[PDB]
Amino acid sequence: KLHQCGLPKAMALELFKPFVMKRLVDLNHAQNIKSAKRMVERGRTVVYD
Amino acid sequence: KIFGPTRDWECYCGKYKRVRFKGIICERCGVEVTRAKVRRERMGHIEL
Amino acid sequence: DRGIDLAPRQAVEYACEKGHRFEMPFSVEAEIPPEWECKVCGAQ
Amino acid sequence: AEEEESGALRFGVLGPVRAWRDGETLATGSPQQRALLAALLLREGRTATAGELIDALWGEEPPSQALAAVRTYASRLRKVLDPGVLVSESGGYAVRGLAEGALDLARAQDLASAAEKARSAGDLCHARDLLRRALDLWDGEVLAGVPGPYAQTQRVRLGEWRLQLLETRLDMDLDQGCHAEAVSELTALTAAHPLRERLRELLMLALYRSGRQAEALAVYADTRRLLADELGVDPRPGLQELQQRILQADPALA
Amino acid sequence: AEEEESGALRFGVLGPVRAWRDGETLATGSPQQRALLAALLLREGRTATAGELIDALWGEEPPSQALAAVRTYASRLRKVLDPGVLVSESGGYAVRGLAEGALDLARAQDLASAAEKARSAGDLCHARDLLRRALDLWDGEVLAGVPGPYAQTQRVRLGEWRLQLLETRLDMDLDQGCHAEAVSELTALTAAHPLRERLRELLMLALYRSGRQAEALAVYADTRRLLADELGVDPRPGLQELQQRILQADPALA
Amino acid sequence: AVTSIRIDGVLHEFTTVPGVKEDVTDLILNIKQLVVSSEHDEPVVMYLRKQGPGLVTAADIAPPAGVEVHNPDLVLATLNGKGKLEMELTVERGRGY
Amino acid sequence: KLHHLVDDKLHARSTGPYSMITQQPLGGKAQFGGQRFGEMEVWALEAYGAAYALQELLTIKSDDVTGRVKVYEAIVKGENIPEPGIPESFKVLIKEMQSLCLNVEVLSSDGMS
Amino acid sequence: TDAALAADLALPIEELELTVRSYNCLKREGIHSVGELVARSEADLLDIRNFGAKSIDEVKAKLAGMGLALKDS
Amino acid sequence: LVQDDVLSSIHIEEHEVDARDTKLGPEEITRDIPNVSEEVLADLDERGIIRIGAEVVAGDILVGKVTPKGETELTPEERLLRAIFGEKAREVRDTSLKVPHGEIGKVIGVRVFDREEGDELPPGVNQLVRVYVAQKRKITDGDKL
Amino acid sequence: DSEAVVPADAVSFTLLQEQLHSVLDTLSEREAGVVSMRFGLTDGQPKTLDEIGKVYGVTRERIRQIESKTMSKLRHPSRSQVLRDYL
Ligand SMILES: [Zn+2]
Fold first, then answer.
1. CA E120 – CA E123 distance, rounded (Å)
2. Which of D47, D149, D152 sits opposite I25 (nearest CB)?
3. Which chain J positions have a beta carbon within 8 Å of E64's beta carbon?
4. Of D8, D30, D5, residue with least CA distance to D21
5. Domain for residue I124, yes or no?
6. How far is the CA of B1 from the centre of ligand 1 (A)?
7. Binary contact (I143, G9; C-beta < 8 A)
8. Structural domain contains residue I24
């Protein structure tokens, strides 16, 4: 559309990494922050979702 | 002694490594125990 | 820095030959040395 | 006895602190001195600085002027051991001249690695002999009578390593066809340590094929009661799974 | 009697704990210091500290002066026994100077290992002789008049160890064909101990090899109804296989 | 089509086999042109073996039952006198790329 | 096929290495740096009138040692972004000017600082 | 009363506090919840091997202690 | 042009690390990386070298070098956590060589230089290791033609 | 600069402190009290078993027994995943 741009997966993961960890802990896919960071560095499909 | 410690809450003579007694002056070397970032803000002078 | 109790501090006054007087703290358990430098002019 | 060469200096940490100089003992001395020699022994020969050793002996509050204390402990070690076996660099202390078999800990890692290699190769007799030699290494409680939270740290670390080593020993005993001494050891260890889930899973596995079912599930019920009283949670799913397949009595793992 | 060496100090833990010196018993004294001596004796020469000994022996609630109590108990042991046997090491105490074959436990393990080696080599008579001499070292109930939870734990452990030794002797005696005493001893064990179903499986083997058939099926029905009433689980596939092999009149077992 | 291979004496696709005139990646390129048919749902492992001087073709492959090569005249590699080529080709059934 | 490839041109930063003489994030692809926000960028943000976005791009997201860690904590915990402090590069400027015998002092409405 | 029945169905079989025989019999079949036993009909537990009438009576008295009944009973 | 392997190229990327004897002590290349799962070190050799042909990804380990000593100021929380779990007695820091972000490839060749051997090395260092990783980059979005 | 503070490290430290306080509150009150002083978690100074035997009044045997029981209970794998990744 006029107001949309397409970021890559790696770019959007590295830009929005702290928000991704916050939502992962909120969605309890990881038990705490360190495990969320471990999954983000590993890069599982739940992180992309 | 003048600018401040290079580590965090340590002094020059190797003593006073602990954080509890912060804000005191070492007797052996005179280095104030404080953060390492104070060396970004503390200046001396040269007497000509 | 939360809940940490600082060591008790005492005030020892040092006077130089030029009359400069300054206040700097010492620890209670630390020994008090009679020899020190001057903050203003560096005199004894 | 076959590895007792001439001039051999043997050091031991798995049991208490002792020194064997070609068959005769050496007075290791004070409990803090024992802890110092052990702390030098755990580091496989670092030059470790004076402040690090001071922290290792005592921790958060070592007396202020006790650097000379550690100095005279080093003097004690130097006069009770060889002059050249201990050498100092830049204020740090370092024990060298340690050949193969001098330290029981190095022999322990060597035997563990050899047992792992034999398990990878599928051999059973040599691996059983290696872990039989390994279980003769520890003598009582590790680091007998040494202060320092550091010493507590390697104490609990070596205890946990011993727990996994005996878990592997009991597991290969079960898979090779040994059950009687296996259930004896498992009962003795659960008497010693009542809150290990893995050893009680090993109890279930061992009693499941040795002809014992009632007391196995009685011990399981006791485990459930104690774990609900002290933790109030549910045990690991692998346990419940192991008890489950047990219940339908599959003869597949015979 | 052939191994009664002069000057050898022998100890016994398979029954009541006593100290023997050249065939003459020693004044052990209080049962509590007997419990301490058994705690040091059961380690087969392995050392221990005072703290772990007190925690294992005296349970969760020691009194306010346990250290003086264990010190004076060890002192009394030092008077009654040889000074060199009891040694101080890092604040802990241990039993040293134990000769080979003097301790009944170490002799029992050595004879069990020799019997296992003979069975692996096919020497059944030597193995049964060695583990019958080892079974003669038991003086009735283990740890008579010995208090503490540690006493109960090793009492259970040595009881099941004796039971499994009797079980393996029984099955190789059945393999040897000497079923006359084996049937009576199996019936006595099943009357005494209804918990270890390997003993009843050996009873099925003995009944099938003896010749009687209907009484074996009656014993099978009794075992099935007890495992239904007090346990309720299905029988083991090995037990079912043995039962159907007995019912099919397999000539291989006979 | 072939979806995975394995050559004895080779740990990765960027090295070369001792005794073939072209590298392993050119062999990867030549394998991609090899068309096969397989009725088995499960992956099937073929075998390729050739020794001595010559010119290995697709016909020299050894396919099991239910797997056959349909272009046996395709050139795969060229072997000199010291050429060793043992190769376990895996075929899988699928669609697209 | 040019060597200006896409597999190496991609580069992104959340929080990486920082420069030493000044507390701005450093630069470079191999060093996990941040893209430079130049002068004309600041002119464009002034032109939009977006004071807050420009102010946070200059203080929160770089060269505020008491700000970056607090903001990361606030994001991970989920609370709102804290108020910005003073960039460390301005303090470096003050310490530089104060050493050329220039009596540079910051005074508020009530008094000195 | 929805929360009460949800809590009653969500409790495991360890809270039943009954003999080891019936507990082992029900865990052998894979039943690990009270509601799973509730959903089972009479023929479901009357066909269990080594399950006598005493076990059925004890279970019935147990559920009667908790106040609920069987299915179609 | 993707399925026929028309526009693709081999890209060999080189990055190395060396072991040096500093003031605290010499770092060593080894296997026993602290505080890490055994699965991470599944593709290492005995001397701490990744196998030739091991598939690597971002953040994976190539050569295991352990820093001999870092400054130890343990908080009581970390002290009690260490007491709970038990920590290795040699105090080492994980500064081993890892693959940078957004990089994949096959380890196609490793070169190891040693001071104890006859090979020349710069002063101070003792072990130098070179690891080549190669990827077959295919054409995709954003490539410049 | 190695002396530069990493925001991830500080977040991990404060979350470790919060989770340690949470798991201390999870345990029993007396066990929490005795562990709070053994490593001196509450203050900056750890205390020995003889040091705490006067204010609370138990023997060395019992205080070290309950201490080791607390270490064993925290060593159970249930209360491990909340701390194993925290190292
Ligand atoms: Zn000083």
1. 8
2. D47
3. 59
4. D8
5. yes
6. 9
7. no
8. yes
Asked if residue I42 is part of any domain, the answer here is: yes
Query: G22 to chain B, minimum CA–CA distance in Å?
Result: 10
> What is the CA(B13)–ligand 1 centre distance, in A?
4
CA distance D91 to I89: 20
Cβ–Cβ under 8 Å, residues E202 and E171: yes
**Residue contact H50–E233, C-beta within 8 A:** yes
Domain extent, residue I125, equals 8-138
Any chain D CB within 8 A of the CB of I83?
yes
Element of type H or E holding F76: strand F75-79
Q: Virtual CA dihedral for E63, E68, E72, E75, nearest 10 degrees?
A: 140
With touching defined as 3+ CB pairs under 8 A, do chains G and A touch? yes
Count of F-I CB contacts under 8 Å:
22
Q: Is H41:H72 a contact under the CB 8 Å cutoff?
A: yes
Our count of domains for chain I comes to 1
> Which residue of G32, G66, G76, G81 to mutate against J (max J Cβ within 10 Å)?
G76
CB contact under 8 A, I59 and A41: yes
Tokens (6 digits) for J78 = 């249930």
Give the containing element (helix H, strand E) for I130.
strand I125-138
Do residue J4 and residue G76 have CB atoms under 8 angstroms apart?
Answer: no
Whole-angstrom distance, CA of residue E22 vs CA of residue E8: 6
Cα distance between residue D58 and residue D74, in whole Å? 16
Handedness of CA I58, I61, I63, I65 (dihedral sign): positive
- Output the CA–CA distances (angstroms, integers) from residue E188 to D82, E182, E208, in the order listed: 64, 10, 18
Are the C-beta atoms of residues I107 and I51 closer than 8 Å to each other?
Answer: yes
Technique of determination = cryo-EM
Report how many helices (DSSP H) and strands (DSSP E) chain D contains, helices first.
10, 5
Separation between Cα atoms, residue I19 and residue I25, nearest integer Å = 11
List chains adjacent to chain A, taking adjacency as at least 3 C-beta pairs closer than 8 Å.
G, I, J
Residue B32 near residue C39 (C-beta atoms within 8 A): no
Point out which residues pair with C10 in neighbouring strands: C26
The identity of residue F48, as a single letter, is L
Q: Is B43 on the interface with G (CB under 8 A)?
A: yes
* Buried/exposed code over G78-101 (b: 16+ C-beta within 10 A; e: otherwise): eeeeeebeebbbebbebeeeeeee
CATH code assigned to F1-97: 2.170.120.12
Task: Identify whether the C-beta of residue F53 lies closer than 8 Å to the C-beta of residue F80.
Answer: yes
How many CB pairs below 8 A link E and H? 26
CA dist J16 and J10 (Å) reads 10
Chains near J with 3+ CB pairs less than 8 A apart are A, B, C, D, E, G, I
The chain D residue lying nearest E238, using CA atoms, is D251
Residue I113 in domain: yes
The angle formed by the CA atoms of residues J78, J82 and J84, to the nearest 5 degrees, is 90
Closest CA to D140 of E11, E53, E12, E70: E53
Closest CA to J77 of D163, G113, H4, E210: D163
Question: Facing residues of F67 across strands?
Answer: F38
Burial class of residue I16 in the structure, from the number of CB atoms within 10 Å of its CB (0-12 exposed, 13-18 middle, 19+ buried): middle
Check which CATH number belongs to the domain holding I19 and give it: 2.40.50.150
What DSSP designation does I100 have? P
Q: Which of D85, D78, D82, D11 is CA-nearest to residue D41?
A: D11
* Separation in Å, CA of E61 to nearest CA in chain J: 7
J61 to chain E, any CB pair closer than 8 A? The answer is yes
CA distance I6 to chain D (A): 44
In this complex, do D61 and J45 lie within 8 Å of one another by their Cβ atoms?
A: yes
CA atoms of D198 and A28, how far apart (whole Å): 27
The pair of structure tokens assigned to E223 is 């075992």
Q: Please give the structure tokens belonging to residue E85.
A: 């046997």
Contact A32 J86 (CB under 8 A): yes
